């Protein structure tokens, strides 16, 4: 059927917790076998654990998504296993909350390194392998509505996703050709243990409801359906393209 | 669950054939019971019985979209059918092509409202009648490439796709509060009997598959997907997007 | 020289007041004579009167932008003397306040036929001669920020701002090879007589002021710079773009 | 005066040659006094010495932008003597072409710290002394038509090139209430010397003359005018703004 996964596996990254955490278990329940990513081991373990509990076939393999050779090692030990990745969710990426002027180097650096170039770095070593299998893939990137729009004392971040959206348009440009689809999700405010501290201030809170013209906060379950859409045959034909899960947030003035 | 839209009425515009069509039979499949509309109500009964054939519980109502008295009348006679319109999508409009300098104002004319006025008429009825009966509900509205970047002699058809983008957000804006979903899709390049003229012409041919980095034109089930994702609980909280179906022709320079 | 207009004629519609009688003074002081076009005769020749006196070359035509008739017969008067329009500006359009569900369709089609319709037949006899006399010309669509996102009661407005936006596109399209550029300005929160009722609410004045990272409405002034620049030969290689003057608001999520 | 820069001191990074002793000597024509900025200390002298016999007010000061040290270095050098820099334009960076999959990691992060983080650097150091000085200032990044779609073998100066349009906006968000507008130029193909290559291959020139509805390569003096603009007061209410200058490229399908 159109949107199911069964036969598939999906690599996620960053995903022992929060919205990546969620995307791993919405695909399992399209019938993907999921495959979590942390750089923490044992939290890994206890995510992977849940889903398995759950009835789900959950994996593990923690790697740094800015380390190349930690990121190689852990798809060639796939490799040996047999494992082949049909869908990649570059998930992973940190927040530093500074002003521009105040910004350290090195936080700056981290920024750019977690959401951009471990895209790049993660995507190069699944499409390879897409190419070489000729199975065809599907490579979802993850964005914000800061790729299209800057949120103060964000700038690396902001940076980073509106580098995400056109790193997107690349992976179209150079892997359509094989068949692979390669797209991105923007969520909007997404209720997520996270963002707790936003969601518990009261002016935080009615500045998200003024914002978005659902008046409501998103739920991470939310963006289960657009990804299952990228991941699976219904977007055969859709490639280069970013999808913002946010309410109408960016719809209005 | 969450791409099933068993329990939901769909009203298609223009859907005797071509891309209208293919969202009323995709709709259909994914368990929905579609009203099929056009303006020739020949074609249109032909069109519905070919689906009844097939096993899917279709019906048709023929109007004029340009006309709200007609529009008016089709859902007033919907309403006393207890028939509920759960998802709009305003696929009708015609083409025009002339140049500028050569195009009369009665051809611009034509193409502005059959492509954008229609698509705010058959919505605000359809609207009042979610809103009224707090159902929530889901409107598509049908832009084009041409909603982000324009072709030459097809000028009003652009204007009009253009505004339909942006008539897309004002749904968003206005409507999203009352648990209605606004989106819209952009079909690229896809093989339709309209098309034929264009697909059987080498030189256009080339350009198309050169364009496009997926390196070949769409078919109409290709867009069902992202038809059935915006028509379903999946798109609960997107709203004023458009997704572009074009195998990754705007990400490509 | 780079941003003088001497020796060019430009004709601006909707220029009896507001930002379109800014935009002509502004061509004016850049060297241009200026043609003044509204419906409103009497207080036109106030207009041009008013930069007559301080020292332009200002003069008076009016006609209805929606009067295919009215625009060839005042082009003819035009081409019967030695008049050559170099430089366009559409802003001619009006405003209508009114949520979707209780807008008629008079008023709805009102705001597109005099907003987006207007662009186009005004364009159309101003291209046909430009491309006639191989002079080259100019062409600037007035936009809205609601070309890129929506505000709530302003539906139709919104859609014929983004048609103007996708139609502009549609010119450099047809006629950057004639050396016509063909641009549109996006005018943000400007302190003009249209705003006088958002400028007077408390509640607005502050949205605008928190919306804006500039914590201010703009002056119309700050429009004549642009107006100036899409005008002259600064922008030559500039074609089918649209420049919002905003003060940062569509930067800032 | 509206376009006038005598008083206003430029900084314009890369700028020994090719487009950014373009935009140098641009913006000293419109009455700026200019700062050349390179690497290599003998090249940049030649060039600073170039316009100095042209009788233009031009000085040079060689860093490594991606380096933070030598960076501060330069200004706390001009802060140490009495140089306000009150105009910063961003030109430095590389280009690398090669597709994804036979990408390095080194050859990646070159481009992304040459051009995106290069930004980040120079800006911080020039908005925390216009911010000190509060006399407003003026920054300009520059972008590429890469900011909004990609080409095939340029992934990492595609994705640093989004994140400049992004980052741009958060200059905006951020520095727009002290007065600073800091905005984009988005050069199409012109022809310059690092386009050499690409102006000389028959099939190339073919294919720039086709995708731009004005048929031809730019020049670089017809992107001074967009540079000198946002220098000067006629950009003072716009902010996070990026201006394409591609003849029509992007504005055609
Ligand atoms: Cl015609
Ligand atoms: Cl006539
Ligand atoms: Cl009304
Ligand atoms: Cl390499």
Chains 1, 2, 3, 4 share one sequence.
Not at 34 to 48: P, Q, Y
Not at 54 to 67: E, I, L, P, S
Request: charged share 20%; net charge negative; with cysteine.
């Amino acid at each position: 059927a159109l949107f199911d996964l069964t036969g598939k596996t999906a690599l996620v990254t960053g995903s022992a917790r929060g919205l990546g955490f969620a995307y791993a278990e919405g695909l399992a329940a399209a019938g993907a076998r999921v495959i979590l990513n942390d750089i923490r081991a044992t939290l890994l373990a206890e995510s992977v654990d849940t889903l398995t509990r759950k009835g789900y076939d959950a994996h593990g393999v923690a790697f740094d998504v800015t380390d190349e050779l930690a990121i190689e090692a852990a798809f060639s030990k796939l490799d040996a296993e047999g494992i082949h990745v049909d869908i990649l969710i570059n998930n992973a990426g940190i927040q530093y909350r500074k002003p521009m002027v105040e910004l350290e180097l090195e936080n700056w650096q981290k920024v750019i390194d977690t959401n951009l170039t471990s895209a790049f770095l993660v995507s190069r070593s699944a499409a390879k392998r897409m190419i070489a299998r000729n199975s065809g893939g599907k490579i979802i990137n993850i964005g914000s509505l800061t790729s299209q729009a800057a949120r103060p004392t964000v700038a690396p971040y902001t940076a980073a996703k509106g580098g995400i959206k056109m790193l997107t348009c690349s992976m179209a440009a150079e892997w359509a050709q094989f068949n692979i689809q390669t797209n991105a999700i923007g969520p909007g405010y997404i209720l997520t243990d996270m963002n707790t501290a936003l969601i518990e201030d009261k002016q935080f809170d009615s500045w998200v409801k003024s914002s978005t013209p659902s008046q409501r906060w998103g739920r991470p379950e939310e963006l289960i359906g657009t990804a299952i859409f990228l991941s699976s045959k219904a977007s055969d034909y859709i490639n280069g393209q970013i999808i913002y899960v946010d309410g109408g947030w960016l719809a209005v003035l």
